[PDB]
Structure 1
Amino acid sequence: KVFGRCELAAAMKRHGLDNYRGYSLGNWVCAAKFESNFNTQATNRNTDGSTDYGILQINSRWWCNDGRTPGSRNLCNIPCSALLSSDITASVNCAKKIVSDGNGMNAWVAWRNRCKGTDVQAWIRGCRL
């Protein structure tokens, strides 16, 4: 599924991402925009042979099992395929684990490089939340 901007903001708020570990909802929407363009079916193969999955491009090296990332972990205890669902529950639950890991949202290179320090509230402007 390709979410609308305000549609995704609403889904992320209902699943308790708004101000999760102190990151306002606009941070999460900005991250999803540059990671996946709001497309739950987004995938990206890394040079190390790991893969990124779903709206927040969660990686198979630590967070999910895809059966093809040698030596990897599955800390969210999910198949990577769950991260491509039209239902973002698995993606939000796993993101909560990642953002708790010690580096906050810096875990998302695209958030650091394109969202951090910007007017992220722009991403929820207009939305009935």
Structure 2
Amino acid sequence: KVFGRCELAAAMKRHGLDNYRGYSLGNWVCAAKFESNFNTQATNRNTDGSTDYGILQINSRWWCNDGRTPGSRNLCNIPCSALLSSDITASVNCAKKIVSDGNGMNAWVAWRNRCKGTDVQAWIRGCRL
């Protein structure tokens, strides 16, 4: 499904992402917008054989297992198909593990490119949270 901006902000908040590891809610909403355009079913193939899955475009080489990626490490221990669900729970749980990995939100290229620095709070203004 395609989440509406405020609808997603409320779901990610309910799931403890506001200020998780030092990143305010807007950072996460901003990452979702440029990563998948709020679509839980987005997928994208990479030159190395991996695919990025879901609302947060979590990569199959290190994080989830899709059974077709050479060098798969499955560090969130989850099938990549669980990440395309309408329930963002599995994507959120795995993102909490990715961000804890000593680099933070730099794991998401769209985030470092389009969100890091800007007024990320704009992503949450006008919503009831």
Determine helix, strand or coil for the equivalent of 2:44.
strand
CA positional deviation for 1:72: 1.1
Q: Report the alpha carbon displacement of residue 10 of structure 1 after superposing the two structures with TM.
A: 0.4
Deviations 1:62-110 (A, max 9, x none): 1000000011111111100010000000000000000000110011111
Displacement, 1:43?
0.2
**Match of residue 123 from structure 2:** 123
| Partner SS state of residue 31, structure 2 | helix
Cα-to-partner distance string for 1:29-77 (whole Å, 9 max, x where unaligned): 0000000000000000011010000000000011000000011111111
SS in 1 for 2:52: strand
**SS at structure 2 position matched to 1:62:** coil
For these two proteins, the number of residue pairs brought into alignment is 129
Q: CA deviation at 1:28?
A: 0.1
**Separation in structure 1 between the aligned mates of residue 65 and residue 115 of structure 2, nearest angstrom:** 28
TM-score after normalising by structure 1:
0.99
CA distance in 2, matches of 1:106, 1:113: 9
Gaps of 5+ in 1: none
CA distance in 2, matches of 1:25, 1:46: 28
The structure 1 segments of at least 4 consecutive aligned residues displaced by more than 6 Å after TM superposition are none
Percent identity (aligned): 100
Once residues 79 and 72 of structure 1 are traced to their aligned partners in structure 2, the CA distance between those partners, rounded to angstroms, is: 11
Q: Report the Cα offset of residue 113 of structure 1.
A: 0.4
SS of 1:83's equivalent in the other structure is: helix
Distance 1:104 1:19 in 2: 12
TM-score normalized with structure 2 length: 0.99
